[PDB]
Structure formats: C-alpha cells, structure tokens
C-alpha cells in the first residue's frame, strides 16, 4: 500500500524543553537563565531544525518557542520528504520499532524511529561569555531535561508535558498556527555515520531517563523509547 507509506511520510511534530531553569549545567557555557531567554525572545524567519547541528541535515523548522515557569520550551516540525523517506525505510529494519509502542498507542514506525534515534533536543545559541540560531535533534542533549517528544499532532505533543499550562499551550498554539523546497542535503550514509557517534556518548540512557523523569513524560504515555 502506497497509502500507508504516504501516511508514514507525513509531517512529524517534535516538542520539548531546550533548557530547564532549575537545572545547573555541568558546564558554564551552557548557562541560560530566564531573564536572558526572555530578553532574547523579545528581540529576535523561522529557525531551522537539523540533525545533530549539521547544517546539511536540516529536516524542518521550529514552529514555536516559549519561555515558561520551568524553562524554554519549543515545538518543531519535521517536514523534509527526503529525510522522512530515509527514516521510513530504516524504521522497517529496527527490531526496537517492531516491538511497537506502549499501552494503547497505535504503532507509528517513523515517529518511533525518530523517538529512539533523536531522543534529545539541543539549542544552538550565541555564547554568553538573532541570539537563537537553530534547534538540533540529537541522541541526547547536553542540557538536562531536553527530552524530545515526537507525534503527528502538535496539540498532542504539547499535551505530553504536565508542566505546561493551558495558557502555556495557547501561547504555543498561537505560534504554530501563525507559522503554519526540501532543505535536507544529507543522506542515509550521513545518518549512519552520525549513528556511531551517538553510540559513544557516555551515560546516554541514564541521562535520557533522568530527562524523562524531570519533564514528567514518564507519567504520560508517548513514543519515547528511553
């Protein structure tokens, strides 16, 4: 069925915190307080969404950014057909993906592959020694609490985070509704190459679980594999 294949390659939304205000980074260069964030937000057209900071691996854009009680939260959208097609194909060959999602979620290979491979978000911003450059999907972010949550519906993804308020969501909904050619310039070999790098990030899983617990996506049902 080319019908199912078209559904799999449809856009995919991603949301999560780019930074958590109550978390002390293990590196000074990572400090990003609320005041700065809010100032920068007021100043600085949509930011590109890429794979692990590789500008030749842009897969979409950031649809909304919002500073909330607990940190800087963002919602992006993976729209690159080339990237989605590659993911579709790979998902067909993942045993993890084959086992499917939990409780009552319907399987979604593409979404699941993305959840597993790029479980984290990593912001690219000006050093503190257009402030926001881009957001990257990665195996794990350097800032804690940056768990990436994938889903087909923006509302649904935002609803995965218990910290967010209805007001919070309205601010986000306003943005991704306003904002609402393939920019990807890499390929499967590129992603494959990037994969071995992810395999050597120390304490990847422990950090992911920690992020899951911190942002409460643990107390919700989602496609997260960590």
């Amino acid at each position: 069925m080319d019908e199912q294949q078209s559904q799999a390659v449809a856009p995919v939304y991603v949301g999560g915190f780019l930074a958590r205000y109550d978390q002390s980074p293990d590196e000074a260069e990572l400090l990003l307080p609320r005041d700065v964030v809010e100032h920068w937000l007021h100043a600085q057209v949509a930011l590109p969404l890429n794979i692990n900071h590789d500008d030749t691996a842009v897969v979409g854009h950031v649809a909304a950014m919002q500073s909330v009680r607990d940190g800087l939260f963002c919602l992006g959208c993976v729209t690159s057909p080339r990237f989605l097609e590659i993911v579709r194909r790979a998902s067909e060959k993942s045993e993890l993906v084959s086992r499917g999602p939990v409780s009552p979620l319907q399987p979604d290979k593409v979404v699941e592959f993305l959840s597993g491979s790029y479980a984290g978000l990593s912001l690219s911003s000006r050093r503190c020694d257009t402030p926001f450059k881009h957001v990257a999907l990665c195996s794990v972010g350097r800032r804690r609490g940056t768990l990436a949550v994938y889903g087909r519906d923006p509302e649904w993804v935002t609803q995965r985070f218990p910290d967010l308020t209805a007001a919070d969501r309205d601010g986000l909904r306003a943005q991704w509704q306003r904002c609402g050619g393939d920019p990807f310039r890499s390929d499967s070999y590129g992603l494959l190459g990037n994969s071995v790098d992810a395999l050597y990030i120390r304490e990847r899983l422990p950090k992911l679980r920690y992020d899951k617990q911190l942002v409460g996506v643990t107390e919700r049902e989602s496609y997260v594999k960590a």
Binding site: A19, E29, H53, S122, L123, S124, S125, R126, A136
Partner: peptide, 4 residues
C-alpha cells in the same frame, strides 16, 4: 555560538 554554543551547541547543546
């Protein structure tokens, strides 16, 4: 720039 700092990348996380």
């Amino acid at each position: 720039v700092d990348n996380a």
